[PDB]
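Hi L.,

As promised, Cutinase 1:
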Amino acid sequence: RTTRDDLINGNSASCADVIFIYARGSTETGNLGTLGPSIASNLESAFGKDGVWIQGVGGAYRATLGDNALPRGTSSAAIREMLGLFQQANTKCPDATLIAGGYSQGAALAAASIEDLDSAIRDKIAGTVLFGYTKNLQNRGRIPNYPADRTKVFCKTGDLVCTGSLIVAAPHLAYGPDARGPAPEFLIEKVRAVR
């Protein structure tokens, strides 16, 4: 399913050990889009359904095409939506590990949100996967204020967004295998190490 609201609809008692917050690509479906579900599926298998909450970035993040041309790669309102969710994960379930992810504009949104995040909450994000990261070049394949060794960027050769463009080419559309395999397994590695 392309819409997951496990955290906003979640009750305390049922808090998961792991909370995954994911932002989709521009003009994608639901709040998970095309890669999000594949990544959730894999995490559910690692931790069990009761062990991980899947939470896409919806709400005010409308994932419009125009918003990629704003300064940070997405709108202010979208960043404040993802900020609030990490904020709700922090508060509703204080003892869980956060993990994060995002595709194309959603990658831009993950980056900005995490750069902005209180250090304390950010400390709790074990691993972050970016696919088709639109600020890959601008930010030197980092997320500002976040350690490289918990960041894993998937930026396929010939994906032009990875090299300062916004042209969408065939490699940009080819993160499918990555989202089923290596991207969740990195997030599973990272959680398990700290937990």
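Helices lie at 36-47, 76-92, 105-116, 119-123, 176-180, 182-194.

Thanks again for sending the construct details.

K.
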